Write a protein that binds this ligand. Structure first.
Ligand SMILES: [Cu+2]
Ligand SMILES: [Cu+2]
Ligand SMILES: [Cu+2]
Ligand SMILES: [Cu+2]
Ligand SMILES: [Cu+2]
Ligand SMILES: [Cu+2]
Ligand SMILES: [Zn+2]
Ligand SMILES: [Zn+2]
Ligand SMILES: [Zn+2]
Ligand SMILES: [Zn+2]
Ligand SMILES: [Zn+2]
Ligand SMILES: [Zn+2]
Ligand SMILES: [Zn+2]
Ligand SMILES: [Zn+2]
Ligand SMILES: [Zn+2]
Ligand SMILES: [Zn+2]
Ligand SMILES: [Zn+2]
Ligand SMILES: [Zn+2]
Lengths: 335, 335, 335
């Protein structure tokens, strides 16, 4: 009975970071309390000034990652401020019943509600908005994120030996469907409501206009590139609430990967490219062995390089000539 | 030698049901005898009166599920009545040789034939029509179903412990390619033959017009919704003979899933969303813990909600507040 | 330290064959030396005279398969002759650092370079060209192949028992994006450079014009069909550097399959259809039990039968009536 347990309150942080948390823990079950506030807003999604009439949990695409341990209870307060135009809700794939919670969290502008569910299954799980009659529209306009339910004794390899990460990043991949006018330029809308009909027509073609990580082309590059060091193990959580994607780390590997994202299954090792099913989140570990700027991307290279699904990881430390060496630099073909 | 064994005759039932059968069995191998009759017919596939010039095994999309045990022999009589216009055949992925049987079962209108093969591999396997030169056309017009070959001692979990289901349902997902005229409305054809050329042109775009479960938008909803009870374990067999799909149960999980559909491999647990490769059938178990109406759908939500790939499961029993509770119903944001 | 070890030199062969090599080996680590030469050339890709302005390693699509053992070092000399127009490089997914080697192998026409890396992970891995700013273009015009890193003691099943193949074939699948003119016919270009802009526009639609095995429609059919005998085990290596595919052997199975292509993971058994993620190579074993001509194909049957992704395997030996028998040949439905 959950009414007996202690409560904790967690303060969420914005992607790509994930809020501090323990992996293996001595602590017993708790009710973990979270709050998120919906923000509808217009966002610029590319380097030519294209806009999206977006919908977000807590102002970001994706929404923040919530982290609990298996056996915990998640207690979410969801707030839809009066500054918004649309009703919203939440479906947690990690939850059991009532369409993931959607049936109990229908909130019109100016309202709020509070849901509890048992996080009884370990893994990374998508959450998303699911208003009746307009589910795909809210999802593809940005209303999704990840719940990570860690096993109480931390992650394990196929032989039951312990695994860990020194640092975690969360990547949400968003297939966008931005309409164009008769002139061939993307339309800019005044309100969310006025984008709907043209957007549905684009959706039905199944061809995204843009595919972005974390809300925009180049979100995870330059000053916003991800960071690590030789010797550090990173966990890359990758969510795609609507469409398949195939994550790859260029110059690296997936050392241990749960592509279906469920920690009670053995992970696979040495992956070049893994597969996130639309409607799921997965997770990969990698320990950096070389310094440099890596790219992390969807390995449909058109989706990555033309449509936007790629970021950078900047890695510090010493080059290792045993792993890789330039034996002869580019030079003329001998006469 | 198969000529020594006893024979049985099975009476098929229409999807979503599956014919009665045992899981683990004391009985030894048999020759299991089936018969199916091809019906070409025009079908209405959506709520605005769109028609498909369809082709079916036994009058349904999908065709009926055939269930045997590993080591059995499947003996199929395939009948193509003179009321049909086209030649047809059958390729069983569960079989070995002669292109799955297609080379031995070429039947013109007014003909019939009988094939035997050993069901020597456990799993769910697609069967489909495969006439030389027009294979994709017969498949996407509806000529596919599932053979389920159960291990002789029933299903097992990764540690070799027994698994079972209390009730089985079969779902065939069909990507349809219905042409449109110059006015933008879908074409209605007088005969099967006259649909061919326009349909090929749509196929080559790789963009379905509709994606449906069991032959039509909403086939598995309302009076035709699937049913279960809290405490009951259901097996969901999902076939897709031509295109990938990503099954999800909203408010539930895949407790044990063979996404590649082959029972001698360990299943994965706790899945939110699984993946059926085009050209395969997979199978998932789930034990219901909450009552309510669930949706089972392809989690490309555009394919589900716009194009038709979704059904309902109505579940009876008692709500469980430990799994999920509404702590505060939707109410105004406190002043 | 790699500078201590003996060197070997391997002579590559053209696909679908793979250069002679041992599976399990008594021999210790070596530096294995390879060389490949880039050839840009116009190729005819279908039976109506459509051309592609192609780019290749060693004149073939795919490039040749390189085979080493885990612990070896791969030493590649990459040559870009002055007869070519574009700069090129190589990214080995099997390697660690410097974007797979791409940063160290930038070679303009008339230049060459030599790279070394440790093949420290077992599996089949894609390699491809990756020039900065035009990565998808070089890949989809044909610049990819497979590195196979065999475990030092050969392949193993899930229980650690030995597996082997008697013969290996390499299949590269290429999604092509050939532009059309206002008349609806495919464009024929005079140079590689002049194809670029129109090709990018087609790429962005995500809809290939053709999908071919080994550079053309029907490459692996007729005189070029693959061959085997009843009793022989074949390994089918399948690479797709940009787009997903779903290999199937019609009339056969995947007996043992590493669909993610990494040999330190247990393989799955009895597959009808497996899944190669874009950006990866996978590998399947099958032991032939029936003679005949088999088709090996991408089981999106539109992609196979309309767009070109299918080949043939011609198999010699004796029919087995226990596996499959025609009980009654096609005959009139009894009066
Ligand atoms: Cu919403
Ligand atoms: Cu969902
Ligand atoms: Cu047919
Ligand atoms: Cu098939
Ligand atoms: Cu190149
Ligand atoms: Cu790559
Ligand atoms: Zn309490
Ligand atoms: Zn560490
Ligand atoms: Zn890129
Ligand atoms: Zn970049
Ligand atoms: Zn008999
Ligand atoms: Zn039961
Ligand atoms: Zn829906
Ligand atoms: Zn519904
Ligand atoms: Zn040396
Ligand atoms: Zn052998
Ligand atoms: Zn074909
Ligand atoms: Zn053929």
């Amino acid at each position: 009975d959950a009414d007996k347990l202690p409560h904790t309150k967690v303060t969420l942080v914005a992607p790509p970071q994930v809020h501090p948390h323990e992996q293996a823990t001595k602590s017993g079950p708790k009710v973990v309390e979270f709050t998120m506030t919906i923000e509808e807003k217009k966002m610029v999604i590319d380097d030519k000034g294209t806009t999206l009439q977006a919908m977000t949990f807590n102002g970001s695409m994706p929404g923040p990652t919530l982290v609990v341990h298996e056996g915990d209870y998640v207690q979410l307060t969801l707030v839809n401020p009066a500054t918004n135009a649309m009703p919203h809700n939440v479906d947690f794939h990690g939850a059991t019943g009532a369409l993931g919670g959607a049936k109990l969290t229908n909130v019109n502008p100016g309202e709020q509600a509070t849901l509890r569910f048992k996080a009884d299954r370990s893994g990374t799980f998508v959450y998303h908005c699911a208003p009746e009659g307009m589910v795909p529209w809210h999802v593809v306009s940005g209303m999704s994120g990840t719940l990570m339910v860690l096993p109480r004794d931390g992650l394990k390899d196929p032989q039951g030996k312990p695994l860990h990460y020194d640092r975690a990043y969360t990547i949400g991949e968003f297939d966008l469907y931005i309409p164009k006018g008769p002139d061939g330029k993307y339309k800019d809308y005044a309100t969310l409501a006025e984008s709907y009909g043209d957007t549905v027509q684009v959706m039905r073609t199944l061809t995204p206009s843009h595919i972005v990580f974390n809300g925009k082309v180049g979100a995870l590059t330059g000053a916003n590139a991800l960071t690590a060091k030789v010797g550090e193990t990173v966990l890359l959580i990758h969510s795609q609430a609507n469409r398949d994607t195939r994550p790859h780390l260029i110059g690296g590997h997936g050392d241990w990967v749960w592509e279906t994202g469920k920690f009670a299954n053995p992970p696979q090792r040495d992956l070049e490219t893994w597969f996130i099913r639309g409607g799921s989140a997965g997770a990969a570990l990698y320990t950096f062995k070389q310094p440099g700027v890596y790219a992390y991307l969807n390995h449909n290279l058109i989706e990555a390089c033309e449509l936007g699904a790629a970021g950078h990881i900047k890695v510090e430390g010493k080059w290792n000539d045993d792993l890789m060496k330039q034996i002869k630099a580019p030079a003329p073909i001998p006469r």
